[PDB]
Symmetry: D2
Subunit: 458 residues, 4 copies
């Protein structure tokens, strides 16, 4: 049994002081001065906030990509997540066009079993479409995976054409599945990459120009048009700039059931980081690229007003050594930045503590909204009787800086090296069991379970 007392509870739509008692894995009751049976583990949350466990709807743990593999394992990844306050993560299951989808799903699925410290689930990538695949997708959905993922980029590896996208969306609508999508243009990026390389422009500073804002805007609008035409519900992952936001907003305004996600690096980093040259710049190469800083205000304002629904990380860790695989051509630099451990602290600091982000909008954008969209709610995403006891006792008096020297991500650099944070998790629990106590990791291996969802977007 667990009892968290004297803490100020804050959810997306409530704020109060009371005690939380969890007999087992779920919250049993809430009230003031609760009496917990003897033996109950008591946590004193005096002077601290008690938030629902945070949820990252977009991470990469196991990933064979751009000639190599992402650095975290479900073990190191889930641990880093917990240290950061994230108690549930949704990983992108990404088998390529040449892989068997069902086999890919089972591979990712088995790599996670007994290896995760916190709960998780997947987004099933659809990198090709045919009779064989349709049958396997029906099976994967039936196993509890209620979300797909398509890419409008990465030609021949992940990208699907209009015909495949259309079929994926019709199937999704039939199964009540929500489709997440990476929006760019596979053809344009490929052509622009070749053009720049043939011109001798090989440095990391040509990554952004090879896939400008106009391309993300085109893909975002195309995706919205297919959703509107098929009747399927969609979700745009890591939207990074105004032109794309305008396209997604226009779709929302005319009634298209589409949702928007932005990832932490696009709120705090900008294109100049990728113009520093050398391995230093390679550390900030991702897709969509970091943009002109003028976009940060746009994203922050949109987040405050709820135009942007969720905030994820698109966590994709690589070692500087791996980044150097593209010292000859920027097209060979493995795309990705690590952030699964810093999302919450960064969002809280620069959004709530030093920004205009309302604290309730913060909880909604970093936990509740994602739980709702992907069928994890009310099990996850909030604090209420019946919900899983995934809690985060947050300390707002803490002051420090982020550094690779103190991170738990299995790679050699931190994207936010030196950034200050005005808070951090003091205690983190997973289904009633303490995983982090006073900055000390005390999690239990294999405690995390796979969360199965029910389709709801017909």
């Amino acid at each position: 049994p667990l009892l968290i007392k004297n803490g100020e509870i804050i959810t997306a739509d409530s704020r109060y002081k009371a005690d939380i008692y969890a007999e087992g894995e779920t919250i049993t009751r809430i009230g003031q001065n609760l009496e917990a049976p003897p033996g109950t583990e008591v946590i004193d949350a005096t002077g601290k906030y008690v938030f629902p466990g945070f949820i990252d709807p977009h991470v990469h743990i196991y990933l064979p990509f751009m000639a190599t593999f992402a650095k975290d394992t479900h073990e190191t990844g889930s641990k880093a997540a917990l240290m950061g306050g994230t108690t549930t993560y949704i990983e992108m299951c990404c088998p390529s066009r040449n892989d068997d989808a069902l086999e890919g799903y089972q591979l990712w699925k088995s790599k996670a079993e007994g290896n995760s410290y916190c709960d998780y689930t997947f987004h099933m990538a659809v990198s090709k479409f045919d009779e064989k695949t349709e049958g396997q997708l029906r099976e994967i959905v039936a196993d509890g995976i209620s979300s797909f993922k398509i890419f409008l980029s990465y030609k021949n590896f992940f990208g699907v054409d209009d015909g495949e996208m259309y079929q994926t969306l019709r199937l999704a609508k039939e199964l009540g599945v929500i489709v997440t999508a990476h929006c760019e243009n596979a053809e344009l990026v490929g052509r622009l990459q070749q053009k720049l390389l043939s011109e001798g422009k090989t440095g990391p500073e040509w990554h952004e120009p090879s896939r400008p804002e106009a391309v993300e805007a085109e893909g975002t609008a195309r995706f919205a048009t297919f959703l509107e035409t098929t009747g399927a519900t969609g979700y745009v992952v890591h939207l990074s700039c105004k032109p794309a936001l305008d396209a997604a907003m226009a779709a929302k305004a005319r009634g298209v059931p589409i949702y928007i996600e932005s990832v932490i690096p696009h709120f705090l980093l900008d294109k100049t980081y990728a113009e520093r040259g050398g391995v230093e710049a390679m550390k900030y190469i991702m897709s969509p690229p970091l943009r002109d800083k003028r976009n940060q205000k746009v994203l922050w304002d949109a987040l405050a007003q709820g135009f942007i629904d969720t905030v994820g990380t698109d966590h994709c860790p690589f070692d500087t050594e791996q980044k150097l695989l593209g010292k000859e051509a920027f097209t060979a630099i493995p795309n990705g930045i690590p952030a699964i451990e810093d999302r919450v602290n960064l969002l809280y600091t620069y959004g709530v503590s030093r920004g205009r982000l309302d604290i309730h909008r913060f909880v909604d954008a970093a936990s509740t909204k994602a739980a709702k969209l992907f069928g994890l709610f009310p099990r996850k995403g909030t604090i209420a009787v019946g919900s899983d006891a995934d809690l985060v006792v947050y300390d707002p008096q803490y002051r420090g800086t982020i550094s690779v020297k103190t991170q738990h991500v299995n790679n050699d650099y931190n994207g936010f090296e030196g950034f200050e944070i005005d808070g951090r998790p003091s205690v983190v629990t997973v289904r009633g069991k303490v995983a982090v106590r006073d900055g000390q990791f005390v999690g239990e291996k294999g405690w995390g379970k796979l969360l199965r969802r029910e389709p709801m977007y017909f």
Copy 2:
């Protein structure tokens, strides 16, 4: 003591089954199978929803307007509200340009004391600005009223000019007050009214053309520009059409702290109702006017995505006899439609039950958001330990129709006569005390209190 058991609790960010125990006026604890001391009043909510008491941020009880007076009293008005599921209402305190603001405030304030069945508070109208008035506004704010109200229409009676609007906004920013605003154009409406009358166009069907969508759009954009320039936080009341929504959305997108409210009649009624001729058409005359029905989809879609923040009624009851005061000229028809009693059932029915409105967005738009914006939260607007026990046991199995024959509004007609509803309040409580039991009004006169707020928008 009160105990509501076996009900499905639904708030903006939670959904579960548990019992709610309120020892006194606030919720003491929540859990499953709670044991209430003997003597506790037990309500069985089996098979029913338990929502937070709903809040109407825009009503008119006492109102000397257009040569006459609104029909409801705080007694009949609060009763009608409760029957409909609304446990808190914010009334527009409206002294005209020729009245002393402080006296006006005190008049409204005393008419409500001991006469309301549920809690309430006010929006202080600023229909002129000068040294004398500034001093009185500071006093009214200090008395707990944290919101102003200005009109960009009704020349010489309620309307303020750019100079006055600017000063009102600067003062609001200084005091941390949020400014609500009726957005049209006092001059244009006056001119267009005169033009139409001089042309012999006197029927009710000329009301809409006298203040077209372009006018509301102009006023909405003007208001946004003054907010952006003064640094004040604003709130647009009863936004009725796309052009205006576009203007308010553009302001939101560029960072202006502005919020949007729409009232129920603009979601379900349209301009043709005011083109029926005679007293029948006069029943549907209000400002802003009912619009072309193409606007209803726009508003519904915007509500579903959270673009529109709150839903109110702009409740302004008049008898058909009073409406006839303008049988000679439409300009003399007292503007207003009654709706304080039907808002919740209408929104639930056409939004949740038969529409695309998510049930959590429904609670937020009809209760929580308004509580947050006007400083009533967390006291009101949600279900959580510490909050006032304002609850609504809602019956989703109920089926019926709205009719003046069964309303409690103190006038002779219902704007939604004949409309079907797929639910209704079964039990309604105010701070732990039952006011409505099984469709029977059992409220206590004078139980309602004035809610004082703290300024928060500096």
Copy 3:
């Protein structure tokens, strides 16, 4: 020699009364009371307007399409054009994906030689892209054809994919060629067509729903993105609705060198014509489909302000008998409406005479702009010394109605049967030679020549 005297000359940027003297094929001099050598043919234009010969930048004479062939020949087509005041037309050379481009060009080219009454030129369609084709396109451009044409629809027959579109645009930029484009989405239209048919919806009234406005908007925006990314100059053919106009305007506003064309049927006809059922409805089936009439005001306003650059017809004549080829499924109805003969009179009547279209904007939209965009200017498109003596003595006192009974188009129905017109050509000349005198056709077979252009958009 030719002398047109006492006429009021009206061009896009001039208006005056004077005489025009053409010694041979071009205008020799302009002035008042000019003395023409003896033998000169004198035309008295007293009380009439003298416009530059009008130009239709989008017609179909020879066209193997949808299992059949368009009805006009270069002989009947050029004659009908002249009777209507059009002295130059640009035909779409359309070999399909299975045809050899160079052979296709030569086929169209030889069908026109010695068979046209007026001058003409072509837009070279690129329905596929490969090494073989690139070489042939370079040859065709070198032969004087400075414009391409790509289709974003008609899968497997005319439509090109993103890869092919990109390559076509890069080549166009290299050669200084302007690319015209039909903007929809080949995949979406195909899928939506199949869906409707499988649902038993086979009538002509399902044509519009099979390719809604959202699709044209998507293709228009996609095209604009590829122009912006490749640096090529583009031109959107027959833009029919607001969503598409918005997309093209956004591109214009941000600096993309893109131009807009709209065709006469979209200004005067609407979707209901295709909902009349039977062969009557089949007469109004075209692509993009006739739209909701709310779009006509949008197009007219855009034309008046110069947002829409040119007005063409997309003349594609078919007999009702041929239209019946799709009595079983709307997908088999040959798309197209005839209009080459009525464009000028219709535009003049409903635009200038009865609309808000300025007479100079009329000349620019129906003649000069197209001549400029496609390199026919200053040879064609205006009245000035040195220009070809292609003139139209227009009679503004004429009043009549359009009817198939008096048309010269080689088919059995007129799309504007019964429409009134407030003017008509009295005299029409081609390079100094009279082709139409007092409504009598006196043209000379084979007089028309192929106009070769110089590339100018690098």
Copy 4:
């Protein structure tokens, strides 16, 4: 008699080589190898362009403003205009609120008689509205002035309120007059000015912040709303930024008869010039203020596509000594920059020679469009038989720089000091009489006449 031979004639819709013969004040005939009677003055235009005399629709010669007077006289002003290629200018007749409108008109009118080297006309400012004024405006219009001018700024001196603006527009519609307007917000500018001064911010660098882009956008949109509501035709003077352009474009798109003008300094100068401090910065203080340079591309692109209709100067010359009148407070710096003499060369150089501005669009934006809008066409604005012989033989081989040392404007500084130009007028004529020959001024005092217009916008 005048004969200009061997020149390449370029108008907005024609380009050719021929001779122009003017027997008297108007062009008599055009053709190749024309024979002029003996005594005819012959100008050889070999290797040069022959443009229509350029027209500046917005200048200030006589102006009592901000405690002082503008430096040019109709003598020095018209001379400077001619040297620059401008043969017709429209001056803003600006009596303030305290002046009698009719007297003001007559004052301006008499100051110009016999004192202008080239033709001219006026825009009648309406700085207040009442019965007395309406009567005088009817008289002024009857005297040939077909355009009004209202200011939405300069409180109590020039600015009119909504009531006055509405009445001015209704009268304009009745008389068929077009209304030009300076769009900002009198109240907001006044308040923001006071706020900044009270904060000790007195330097020239606070001018822009005192009237930000949001204000011009608000005024532009307000003006458009009143035009749309009254049915009057409008024209926005010196539009300087994207937000305002967006507002004016939206109005154009929905059918409002509104036109846009931008002045040369907003295309080439930016806000930093006014941040140089001291008298140097004061030289660049005008209204609307110079903006962030990001706006220059927007304006250039809009001009190339015809979104911006005309290009003027808003010529308002002051001596540095006069500028110093506001060394204590920026609000006292007389607003204005000189440019009447450099407009054409600057537009030609940076638009045509070094930009993307098409040469025909150049002639239209600098001459023809303005002539059309203000009823000067076809008398002025083009080259054609019957038109006034106002011609400009332009030399495209000339290369030089602009300097106060060689200007003819009656003040001590040039706003474009040091700017390079790729052309200049070689010969300039006014109604058949040479005013400038090979850079030498040979004009005749009092030759210029007042141009009376006919109302056309009912």
